[PDB]
A paper describes a structure:
5 is the terminal oxidase of cellular respiration that reduces O2 to water, coupled with a proton-pumping process. The third proton-conducting pathway, the H-pathway, extends for proton pumping from the N-side surface to the P-side surface.
Thus, in contrast to the binding kinetics for the second (low affinity) azide-binding site in solution (faster than the time scale of minutes), 3 days of exposure at 4 °C is necessary for saturation of the two terminal azide-binding sites. The discrepancy is likely to be due to restriction of flexibility in the O2 transfer pathway induced by the crystal packing.
Residue numbers in the entry:
A (entry chain K): 6 to 54
B (entry chain A): 1 to 514
C (entry chain J): 1 to 58
D (entry chain F): 1 to 98
E (entry chain B): 1 to 227
F (entry chain G): 1 to 84
G (entry chain L): 2 to 47
H (entry chain M): 1 to 43
Amino acid sequence: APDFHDKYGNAVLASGATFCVAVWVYMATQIGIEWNPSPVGRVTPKEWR
Amino acid sequence: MFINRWLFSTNHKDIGTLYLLFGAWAGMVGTALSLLIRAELGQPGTLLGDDQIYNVVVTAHAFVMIFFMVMPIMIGGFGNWLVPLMIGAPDMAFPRMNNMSFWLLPPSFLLLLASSMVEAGAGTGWTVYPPLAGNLAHAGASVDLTIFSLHLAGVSSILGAINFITTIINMKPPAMSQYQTPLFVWSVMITAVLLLLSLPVLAAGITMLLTDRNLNTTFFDPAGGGDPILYQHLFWFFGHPEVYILILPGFGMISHIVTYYSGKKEPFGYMGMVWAMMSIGFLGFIVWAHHMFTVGMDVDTRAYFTSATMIIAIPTGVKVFSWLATLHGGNIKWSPAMMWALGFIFLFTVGGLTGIVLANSSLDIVLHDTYYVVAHFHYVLSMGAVFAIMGGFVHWFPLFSGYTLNDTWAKIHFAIMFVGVNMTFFPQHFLGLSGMPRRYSDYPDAYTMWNTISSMGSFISLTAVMLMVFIIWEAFASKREVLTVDLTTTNLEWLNGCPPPYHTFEEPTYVNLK
Amino acid sequence: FENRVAEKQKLFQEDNGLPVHLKGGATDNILYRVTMTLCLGGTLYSLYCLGWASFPHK
Amino acid sequence: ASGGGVPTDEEQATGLEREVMLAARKGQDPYNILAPKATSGTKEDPNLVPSITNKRIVGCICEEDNSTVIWFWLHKGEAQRCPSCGTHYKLVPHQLAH
Amino acid sequence: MAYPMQLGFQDATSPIMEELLHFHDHTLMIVFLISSLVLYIISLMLTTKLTHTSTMDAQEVETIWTILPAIILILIALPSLRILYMMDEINNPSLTVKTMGHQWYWSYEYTDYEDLSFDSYMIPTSELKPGELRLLEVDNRVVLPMEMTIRMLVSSEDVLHSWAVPSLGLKTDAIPGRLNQTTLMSSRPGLYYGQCSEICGSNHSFMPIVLELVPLKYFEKWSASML
Amino acid sequence: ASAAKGDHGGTGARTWRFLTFGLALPSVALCTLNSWLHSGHRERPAFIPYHHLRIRTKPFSWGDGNHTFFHNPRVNPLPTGYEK
Amino acid sequence: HYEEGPGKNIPFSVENKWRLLAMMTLFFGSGFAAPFFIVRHQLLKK
Amino acid sequence: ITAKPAKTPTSPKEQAIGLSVTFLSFLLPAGWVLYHLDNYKKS
Amino acid sequence: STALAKPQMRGLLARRLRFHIVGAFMVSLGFATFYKFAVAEKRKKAYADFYRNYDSMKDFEEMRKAGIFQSAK
Amino acid sequence: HQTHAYHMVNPSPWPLTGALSALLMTSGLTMWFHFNSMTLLMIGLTTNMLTMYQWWRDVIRESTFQGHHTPAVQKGLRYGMILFIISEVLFFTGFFWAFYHSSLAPTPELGGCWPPTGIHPLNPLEVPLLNTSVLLASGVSITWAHHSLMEGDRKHMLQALFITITLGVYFTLLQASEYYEAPFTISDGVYGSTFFVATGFHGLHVIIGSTFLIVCFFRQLKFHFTSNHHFGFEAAAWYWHFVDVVWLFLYVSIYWWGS
Amino acid sequence: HETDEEFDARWVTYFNKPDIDAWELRKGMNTLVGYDLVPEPKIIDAALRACRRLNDFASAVRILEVVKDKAGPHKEIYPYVIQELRPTLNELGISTPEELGLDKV
Amino acid sequence: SVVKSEDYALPSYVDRRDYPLPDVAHVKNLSASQKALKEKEKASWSSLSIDEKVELYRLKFKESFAEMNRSTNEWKTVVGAAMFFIGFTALLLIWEKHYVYGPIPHTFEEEWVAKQTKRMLDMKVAPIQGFSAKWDYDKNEWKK
Amino acid sequence: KIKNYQTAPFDSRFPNQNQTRNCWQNYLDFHRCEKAMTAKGGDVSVCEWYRRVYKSLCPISWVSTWDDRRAEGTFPGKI
Ligand code: HEA
Ligand SMILES: CCCCC/C=C\C/C=C\C/C=C\C/C=C\CCCC(=O)O[C@H](COC(=O)CCCCCCCCCCCCCCCCC)COP(=O)(O)OCCN
Ligand SMILES: CCCCCC/C=C\CCCCCCCCCC(=O)O[C@H](COC(=O)CCCCCCCCCCCCCCC)COP(=O)(O)OC[C@@H](O)CO
Ligand SMILES: CCCCCCCCCCO[C@@H]1O[C@H](CO)[C@@H](O[C@H]2O[C@H](CO)[C@@H](O)[C@H](O)[C@H]2O)[C@H](O)[C@H]1O
Ligand SMILES: CCCCCCCCCCO[C@@H]1O[C@H](CO)[C@@H](O[C@H]2O[C@H](CO)[C@@H](O)[C@H](O)[C@H]2O)[C@H](O)[C@H]1O
Ligand SMILES: C[C@H](CCC(=O)O)[C@H]1CC[C@H]2[C@@H]3[C@H](O)C[C@@H]4C[C@H](O)CC[C@]4(C)[C@H]3C[C@H](O)[C@]12C
Ligand code: CUA
Ligand SMILES: [Cu+2]
Ligand SMILES: [Mg+2]
Ligand code: NA
Ligand SMILES: [Zn+2]
């Protein structure tokens, strides 16, 4: 007889993956976290003195 | 009945269970302290306060994880439950003194929590070096309460080590030689020898620190002719053997778990595993000054400690390769305990290899007191001692309790923990190579990215620890009672059923000589 | 002196179900309660002292 | 230089210590201090395993110097064999009252 | 100094730091290879339904398991100890500088000729000038002559500290009652940073080291101006 | 060595008693005379307030905080010198 | 003698899963909360 | 290992309750302290 | 119809192990060649190239003119 | 009913009362050193003494009165006592290591010499040599006690054990008098620190070993020992030899070599 | 050690013992499948005839399943072995696991 | 049939591909027709029907090899649930950012970073490989 | 004899990382020399080398503490 995995396995895998990717992308990009990446290729140096 | 059974115990299984409960509660305390560490570091700036409250948290994190989680679970919990059953003994040799080793731990933990409540805490590092830990820079009671906490833990384990040595040497069946005892029993015996010899030297050193702080001695104070470096030698003469004490019973459980879920009757190369554990226990007493390569020692002393420290990789590699050879040709059962043991083999090997990097003093000049060392030891502690503990806890939980865990939940738990500890610690290698110091509450801005990821990792391991409590609740809530277990002919601790009766081996096993 | 060990062997082997620490009779009970009372009372007192010492004093 | 005054074990040992001392004098081992010597272990000449109940654990060290011991319950009735080497064992129950 | 997302060591500023980088490269490949050799046997052990569960003879394969690691350790130790003894060789310094650790700043003494000494404290974050580095800058830098062998002597007047500059491969603990020596030689002018490296109380994170390496004649005039 | 004494043949109380009264207690009696002979107070050295001696980094938990546990006024000066 | 068997060789009751949940919540929850309250205590002092 | 079916089956809904209460028992007290840190500090 | 031929039946696990331990070693030599070339050689060359005609006084003057020094304006 | 020879101990309150007595003594030393109060410490010393007394009482009840010390049990206790002595040897080694580290490399604060400037050591040929003869002598008289006991001689066992305890007390009184007479103190730099802490823990062990010998003396007066079964006396004799050997190392290292 | 032929001969003789008992049948098969080999047809043949003397049809079927299992992913091995056993299968009336539907998951 | 906890010391049944002939039969108690089928088994097996052979197999053993060795969908539940709880973790971290962490230091402001970056290039931070090596001091831009 | 003094030279009596005894020995030699020279009415200028070496090597606070202790009568080294 089908067990829990046969009946719900596909849904748990699809929704867990969807949710995980969505909430990590959101946390990573939408709430003000400063990752401080390399300036190389990204920052234009500006006069400081 | 309740007080006679649980406060007055002379029974090795119930005392084992007390140690497992105590060690699980300590593990929640050590986990919260590690999350406060990672919250402070998870963005640049100051979260809590300055380095004092921060290093009180770091200091307590280490002492709780070492002395109140790992040692009580591996030796008090699994050693008391399994050792007498694996040798067919009716109990430990000193069953009443065994209960005092247990009961000295709640008061030791109470002293450590009192140290952090009074004055400003002991913000010294778990090494407690003077003069920072002396009575000028750490005036008041906190560091003496830490010393006393360590004395009580020290007596508990020294008496425990006497009990295990005696029990393992004296209480086997008369036909069983020491070369017919299982590897976990050997690993406990060796760890108990290390405890017996190393703890008294730590007790001497922290007593000297105690009298420098309260009786006007000057062991470690140059004004009286003392030397702060003498404390470091006495402390690490204990502290190097201590890390082999933390991992050896883990090696012993990994050998059983790998053997069992490979469907084998025995681990590959048994006498080489015994030789490897005795050689690692022996060499682990002659290497301690690899913790002191920047203190200003002579070049030839640094050459000797670099070489003696590396040599431990030889017997240790014998054991890793012998675990691989035990998997070889197995009928592999992918149980959640097997996954913990496979994760142990791989993560312990990573951390052993960064240890090898550090053994080179010339490179250790630059890596010492940075996060490269923190990465080295959390790969052997948080992904070796912890993984061997979770491996042995899921493997033997049905023996201790009579109930089964849900294996799907336990595999999920393993998967989350494996992702969280690697995300936590792997980036700390980059922080160490690029120069971030240890014991810092904040860092120059360039170190932001890796600290942020490492702090995010620690929260994933928090989610794993919360789910572990739920999984244990689910097992006791559903009460699926064990019926049959595989391979009892080579795993004697299962043969009295689950859980075994209060008294086992009232009639000893029959073993002939021939 | 005379050897009265046989008397003590009979006393401690009497089949009365008592644990060894109480098998000498009522004086064992007294000494046990005195010990346990000082340990538990002293432990409460050590907690009170922690509570007192956990806060700064004028 | 002469007096006695110190009791002997014969006079004063008691409880289990005495039982073990009196049994050892008779060449008997009711408390399992000694390792039993194997028989040839065939079905006609099985290892005889005393017990005070209806079953006892046997550990079989199948060949000399094996580090692996094979463990199993031996029950009252017909001889059983070690599941690794086949050597035969048979339980002989008594009661320490027989 | 370190830069964002850095993976490995700061670029070498001294010949001995250069040596440590190539030695680290040599060691890390080994680490790589062993790590990967293990992951891989491991996965080889676990990916077949074929079995062989009867007793396996250990002696031949244990020879391989001990001798090849022993040889790998010797391949790491030989260049490791060459470097240890080379750094220890006599080198003839042209200058001696002392540094004393304190809670929480460093002092510096340059007393070969005159009585020159001063204190060196972290620039607080709210006083940084634009472009300066948070937790790393100091008010008084340790000016030193480039391309010259300098003896640094390190001690402390209170608790332990440790005086480190990762780009020069330097870390010497600062212990009261003891004078530890190390040598320093920069191949290049510039600013080279480090941070206190032994836990020393409330502001351990906040007592950094900045070396300013310049031509000898600039160093001499700076010295005279600091009297 | 072998000592210079000379006995054996099997094991005895008699012999260890002979060693107790014939060698061990005589040696104690001898050392007791040697001692009770070089005894009797020695002239105290001038006081010098050396900074590596008379350490006080925290008061002692008894008395006035400044006296050692087995303080002897005749031979143990305080950080400020011998008592008055 | 003492009770033997699953659920009886432990110093806490598993006879009711919800009372067990409460006790386990209090037990692990108190160990996890303690360091946060100690930090609060240290911050509040000075 | 083999075992009997659960004597007291814990249904998905009861698991969701045990899981939620267990997670809240760790999250709430720590969350309250950390939420109020500025209050403890800037006191 | 035709009979099936007799296949190898014995030592299948040993044979698979032999074959793969040799492939495992070959990676290691192949990876070692890459790691030496992509990292270690590249480093030696970056340092040798940087210092080959490096002018430390000229590097100093650029820094000095950029205003970075306390001791040199 | 067991058919092994090992001792299943009755459930006991003494492990808990001893653990609590350790909490009371350590929190008591803390309250003495920092809060000017001896109360907790006296209560923990009292409970510790009460615990020791009842626990070892019960071990005598279990053995001499109830017969549970079969040869297999006694053999375990032999190993236990040897292992304990080994751990006490390692504890003294930490203090010997401290002594040699400071004395072999005397720092400038001391005058760069050993003994430090301003230290006037005791003469090792006076009371220290006397103490050495006392403890060596008491190793001879305990060996006499041991052989008399094995030979079934009650009166000479008691006479030799009394002698051995009298010498233990003599050494303790001699040492107490030398501590009072010493012109240096525990606060006199690392010389006074090593001297008093190493000889002081050794004196505490002499007081422990002497108490243990007095326990054996009263049990012997009560006929508890047989000519073949007397492990408490053997253990106290091994502990007593240990205290003598530690004294010999202290005498040679600190009193003689370090003078 | 011994040749392959000698190994095989000793196992043939083990199962060919006329009065082999049930315990010895089980001990022999459960020991034999611990080795790194799939047993030759002539060994299987002797085990199947021991099943027959012990009036145990089910264990003959289980022996055929375990041959297939010991071959792992070498799917050519089991069909060759059944080919070689067909005269014995037919003489003793042993149905294979496939003919009984016992290969269905 | 029905295994009891009180049987743990007795030989027991196990489906294990490496222990194909377990120590006892899966079913020992027989019905009248099952007793008749065990008698029939003593005669030629060619006279047993396929259903009778299958019934003999299923008296002796619980599961076939193909049954006990079958693959399952469990990995979907494991991987999916682990991703769920990893996703839940990011909720905790969002909460912590919003309610626990304050503003990070002003040195991370865009203009500060531009200036600091130029000052790092002016002091030639890591000029051999790590940082300034990646800047083109001739063309005044990041190397391609 | 040898002006153009730059710093204290390598000294094979004190070849290791701990140089505390080098500072201390030079401090002692200097002061022992100066006592010798001011006793016999000779010239302290002959003690100059030890003075230069201890000034280069020794922390200012150690010299200062040792000079205070010489003045107080509590310097524990022999001069
Ligand atoms: C379980 C705990 C544990 C274990 C097992 C180890 C194992 C080792 N450790 Fe570790 N270590 C710690 C816990 C541990 N460590 C802690 C807590 C600290 C810091 C303490 C502090 O400051 O607070 C630390 C610090 C530490 C330092 C000090 C760094 C510094 O402060 O600057 C060093 C340096 O030598 C070191 C080295 C090693 C080595 C060589 C091993 C070796 O024993 C590992 C040997 C194992 C392997 C090598 C892997 C398996 C082998 C093979 C697969 C064979 C092939 C391999 C080769 C040929 C090399 N460790
Ligand atoms: C005849 C010798 C026996 C000693 C009797 C005296 C009481 C102390 C008890 C003994 C314990 C011994 C070691 C503890 C350290 C110090 C005591 C050293 C011995 C001693 O008695 O030293 C005295 C100082 O005592 C002092 O400070 C006294 C301070 C007394 C309080 C001691 C508190 C310290 C307790 C720490 C113990 C921790 C143990 C750890 C066990 C490890 C677990 C595995 C010397 O007197 P002084 O006036 O300085 O000089 C003499 C001048 N005329
Ligand atoms: C003063 C300030 C605080 C310090 C407190 C310490 C004070 C002093 C304690 C002195 C120790 C007294 C020990 C008495 C033990 C009596 C019990 C006993 O001796 O029990 C014996 C067993 O030995 C046994 O358990 C062996 C028992 C082992 C005892 C170990 C004793 C040493 C303990 C020292 C504690 C060390 C502290 C270290 C400090 C760093 C009983 O077996 P038998 O003798 O064979 O008799 C049976 C025959 O009659 C049958 O025919
Ligand atoms: C039956 C169960 C056992 C539980 C026993 C509980 C006893 C509780 C009573 C304690 O109260 C007292 O308060 C004193 C202050 O009021 C202090 O005395 C101490 O403190 C004084 C200064 O306060 C010193 O001068 C004294 O020497 C010193 O011993 C000390 O805290 C204690 O004596
Ligand atoms: C390091 C491990 C822990 C990290 C993750 C913790 C995740 C937080 C779980 C929620 O904790 C609660 O969060 C509330 C806010 O969401 C707080 O309420 C606070 O905020 C509410 C909204 O402002 C007010 O209604 C409340 O009164 C006020 O207490 C509340 O006290 C706190 O228990
Ligand atoms: C009364 C008693 C007789 C012993 C007995 O057989 O009961 C004797 C025998 C040996 C005696 C002891 C030993 O002779 C040694 C001691 C010698 C002292 O002069 C008296 C106390 C002393 C401690 C004695 C007291 C008492 O007279 C003892 C104990
Ligand atoms: Cu100064 Cu850390
Ligand atoms: Cu170490
Ligand atoms: Mg350090
Ligand atoms: Na921070
Ligand atoms: Zn066998």
